[PDB]
Design a protein around this ligand. Structure first.
Ligand SMILES: [Mg+2]
Ligand SMILES: [Mg+2]
Length: 315
């Protein structure tokens, strides 16, 4: 899986450029307070799985996400909720014939992310309990990945773990660094960036070949002011939460509506990514011996696949 591409349940790519990618990550299934799965479309996940297998491609289900991380901590600290969650993850792998599961908790024991997310000092340890249990329960041929922040999972004082249980690196196949929404939106060099994140995760104990550099097909605008037509005002799943904008401009608005040396990204203020910066990220990933790259998200590209084409050197 040198090149993985996220697709979203609420806006699937009408047509997937299958031979231009290796791996589809389907977002999101949201864990409920009770360890159930929710939020994704049966028929749609079935159909995408069937198409991926027909095209000889692999597909994972992403569990969690920005508004799907409310109950990870609560679920994983307790016992039979942990077990119920593990069993339902095994069962969704059964049901949908999945090649992998991608765990996207944002974030273990963190003040960042959705404000009212459940958080506990033991979140990273129970998260690895979850991964060891999943590797247990699913077999060796199931792909276990996680979408990860720019720094190793927070410790029990809400600081990036300086060392990780190498049962991480031996249980989890790949770690997808979400090196975007940093501030540059997806800076390659920097107080963090893709390079700084790769350094931190390598120093924490995750080898480079199990690290996957995450790149965006969008940019963020600043003067939170509104982005383009897809930036709708939205509130987090917390009572009384203020609804806000993201500032998002997907690549398609940039393209149809017609440089920063330090971060190696383009500015317009709209900080975003084009074929040049994405090629720079690919060159970085190759020079560092990373496992590949992941992209968020596939539907944001244009008809002529500008951004997906600019990534082909990884594969
Ligand atoms: Mg169902
Ligand atoms: Mg996200």
């Amino acid at each position: 899986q040198k090149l993985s591409a996220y697709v979203v349940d609420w806006d699937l790519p009408k047509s997937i450029a299958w031979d231009k990618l290796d791996h589809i990550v389907y977002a999101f299934a949201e864990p409920t307070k009770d360890g159930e799965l929710s939020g994704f479309t049966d028929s749609q996940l079935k159909s995408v799985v069937q198409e991926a297998h027909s095209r000889g491609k692999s597909i994972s289900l992403s569990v969690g996400g920005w508004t799907g991380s409310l109950y990870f901590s609560d679920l994983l600290k307790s016992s039979s909720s942990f077990d119920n969650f593990v069993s339902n993850l095994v069962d969704v792998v059964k049901e949908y014939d999945l090649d992998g599961l991608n765990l996207d908790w944002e974030y273990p024991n963190s003040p960042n992310g959705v404000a009212c997310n459940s958080k506990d000092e033991n979140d990273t340890a129970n998260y690895l309990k979850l991964f060891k249990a999943l590797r247990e329960k699913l077999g060796s041929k199931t792909i276990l990945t996680t979408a990860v922040p720019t720094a190793p999972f927070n410790d029990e004082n809400q600081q990036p773990s300086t060392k990780l249980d190498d049962n991480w690196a031996s249980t989890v196949d790949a770690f997808y660094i979400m090196a975007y929404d940093v501030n540059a939106n997806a800076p390659l060099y920097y107080p963090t960036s893709g390079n700084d994140a790769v350094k931190a995760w390598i120093a924490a104990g995750i080898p480079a070949e199990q690290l996957v550099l995450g790149v965006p097909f969008y940019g963020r605008v600043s003067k939170q002011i509104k982005g383009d037509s897809t930036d709708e005002k939205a509130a987090d799943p917390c009572p009384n939460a203020v609804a806000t904008y993201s500032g998002q401009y997907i690549w398609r608005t940039i393209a149809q509506e017609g440089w920063d040396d330090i971060s190696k990204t383009p500015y317009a203020v709209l900080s975003f990514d084009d074929a040049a910066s994405l090629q720079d990220k690919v060159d970085y990933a190759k020079k560092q011996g990373l496992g590949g790259v992941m992209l968020w998200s596939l539907e944001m590209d244009d008809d002529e696949n500008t951004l997906l084409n600019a990534l082909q050197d990884i594969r």
